[PDB]
Each structure stands twice: as structure tokens, then as C-alpha cells.
């Protein structure tokens, strides 16, 4: 199965760590927890942001242009990214916006962190049709000494 994982501010605004005004180590922990030992597919901007492979996961970069780092696997299409994951129970698509958009039609599961922040930005998580998705897990957390904003972990499965 194919899953998308993402952190969303109000109105589905998303973006690179450098652009977003939150700092949520608990959410990054949740990201790691749910992606570890699974292949991750990302776009080139996301790859440029992290600066090095996410450890303990197969790192696949989707880009129409040739690769510029042999530490990871580079692919040129959606079909090609999926083949590069091989026979695994779950492929994790980790963004950003355009990549989420490209994989959503193939996905059956969404891991969304709803962050209580109003953010000015032009990138959004794709406009999934909520009624077509069933919420199977929800978990709310207050901001604290470590986490700048309140946030809610959600898992949805396609109906």
C-alpha cells in the first residue's frame, strides 16, 4: 500500500522547514516512528532541505532531472518510484506539495499532523475529499516547553 505523511497548518498550508514557523520535535518523532524501516519517496526540494539521507529508510527522490547525489536513489516517474520500493507492505510518500499531489490518487492511507498555526504560504497539501476518507486515529497535543504549537496526529484510510 501507498501512504502519504505530512504536517499541515490551517487551510492545508505546508512547506519546507525553513519556511514554516513551527518547531515540533514530537511531530518529527511521529514522522520517524511511522517512516522508519520503510522506503520514503520525496521531491527534490525536500531532499535539498534534509541535506542527507533519512537514516533507516530507503531514500528515493522523484525528479524529472538527473540525480546529483549517489547516496540515494533517483527516479523520473511515479510508476518508477513505486517499482524502486519493491515488495514492501507500505510505501511512505513524504512530499512536498507537488509530490503529494502526484501520489494521492494511488494512496490508501494518510498520516496528517494538523498544526494549530495560521501560516502565509503558497504550497498546500492536495485537496483530498474528506468524505471519501475515514478517520481511524486522532490524537491531540497541547504546545509545551519543547513544541511551539498545539498539534493533532491523524490517520485516515481511503473508504
Amino acid at each position, epitope marked *: 500500500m501507498i501512504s502519504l505523511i505530512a504536517a499541515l497548518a490551517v487551510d492545508r498550508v505546508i*512547506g*519546507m*522547514e*525553513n*519556511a514554516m*514557523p513551527w518547531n515540533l520535535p514530537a511531530d518529527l518523532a511521529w514522522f520517524k516512528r511511522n517512516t522508519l524501516n520503510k522506503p520514503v519517496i520525496m521531491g527534490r526540494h525536500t531532499w535539498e532541505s534534509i541535506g*542527507r539521507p533519512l537514516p533507516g529508510r530507503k531514500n528515493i527522490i522523484l525528479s524529472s532531472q538527473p540525480g546529483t547525489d549517489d547516496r540515494v536513489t533517483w527516479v523520473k516517474s511515479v510508476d518508477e518510484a513505486i517499482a524502486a520500493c519493491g515488495d514492501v507492505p507500505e510505501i511512505m510518500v513524504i512530499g512536498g506539495g507537488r509530490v503529494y499531489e502526484q501520489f494521492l490518487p494511488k494512496a490508501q492511507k494518510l498520516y496528517l499532523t494538523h498544526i494549530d498555526a495560521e501560516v502565509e504560504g503558497d504550497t498546500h497539501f492536495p485537496d483530498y475529499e474528506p468524505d471519501d476518507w475515514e478517520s481511524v486515529f486522532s490524537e491531540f497535543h497541547d504546545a509545551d516547553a519543547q513544541n511551539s504549537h498545539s498539534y493533532c496526529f491523524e490517520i485516515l484510510e481511503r473508504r
Partner: nanobody
Amino acid sequence: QVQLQESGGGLVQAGASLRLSCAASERLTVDYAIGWFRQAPGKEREFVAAISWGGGLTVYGESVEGRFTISRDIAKNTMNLQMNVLRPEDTANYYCAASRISYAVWNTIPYNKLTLWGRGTQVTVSS
């Protein structure tokens, strides 16, 4: 393409403060981070401070926590490092850098993975 230009280096006594500035020749986008590394004679370059351009979030090298403050102004397209309670071991050439690498990773990223670099400004702290 983007050029970084440092300023504000000089010689001060131990205990004094000094403010460094870095100007970018073109406007940075929200996806950038900008920051300082320093390098003393005979030593490896080390991370000092970084700030995310969009978020304005910051991270500091362990030897300067509490003493240095990094800030940036989006309109002026400039970043500043206010350095306080300077110690002799703070002596180094200070280099401004910018990159799309997440600000939070700058304290461990090999520095040559950041590709926009200024030419450095010398800071000397005497006893």
C-alpha cells in the same frame, strides 16, 4: 548567483560585544536559511549560528549558546549576529553562508554542502 557580503569584524577586548552583518545581493526565498561559520588558524571550520529565512527560527553552536543572537530582516534582505561577552577563543575569520538546507541541520552538516559563501570577516578578541 546570490552573493553574501560580511561586515562588522574588528578587534575588541575580552568581555566586549561585536555585531556582524551579512547582506545578500538578491532576495532570499522563504525556503532558505542563512548563518555563520567560523574558522581560526589551524582549526577546522565550525558552525556558529543559523536562522531560517521564512520562519525566523534559530539554532546555535554549543560554544556560543546564550552569548550570541542571530536575527534577520526580510525587507532589508540582511542578517545580523550580535556577539556578547566575547572570549579570546572566539577569535576567527567569520563566514556568512546561505542554503536551502534546513537551518536545524546546520550544526552537523558538512560545511561544503552549503554553496553560497561570503569571503569572511576577521574577529579578534584580545586578553
